[PDB]
Amino acid sequence: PIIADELEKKHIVLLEMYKQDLKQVQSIFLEGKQFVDSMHENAPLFLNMPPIAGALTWCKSLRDRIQEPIEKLAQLGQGITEREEYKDVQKLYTSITKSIKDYEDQKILSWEKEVEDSSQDKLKQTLLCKDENDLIKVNFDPSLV
């Protein structure tokens, strides 16, 4: 019990630290979400990815960052779950995960439509030769690459 009396105070400080990171991610996600959809220069999307898959991998990287401490918090004893402070963090977490999942659902749904439109282009792509000079080239759509 002598170490356990110290741990009770220590447990409250950990819960406060995870709130700050979780709040900070939320603030980065909101700023980023705008730029990702916009497809601006200096975006959350890192180096050469698709503008759609890049969002999902970005969202995944955030979702993974937040999810590591929770799997650790569950392992702590001394009824951390019964403490009202922990409950306020979990309620915040749930609202962030839902908002991220909703953004992924909008991207996949919009993508699946683009997948149906692209499959048509390929079939009717054929060969295109432009300019007065006959300079035939590969017509392969950038959207297919």
């Binding site: 975006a43 050469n48 950038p142 690459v145």
Partner: protein, 52 residues
């Protein structure tokens, strides 16, 4: 100076003898965002005349 769009400094390297010249590359790592027929060319700077 007066390039078609901006070109991101994709990588840098120093001169092995000493810090006299700095070779630098230029390309877009954003996908398909690179313009059609953008200027593809790396430069090499000297610390004496950093104008051009």
């Amino acid at each position: 100076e007066k390039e078609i769009c901006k070109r991101s400094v994709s990588e840098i390297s120093w001169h092995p003898e000493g810090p006299t010249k700095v070779a630098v590359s230029y390309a877009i790592m954003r996908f398909q965002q690179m313009p059609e027929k953008m200027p593809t060319q790396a430069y090499v700077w000297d610390l004496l005349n950093p104008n051009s």
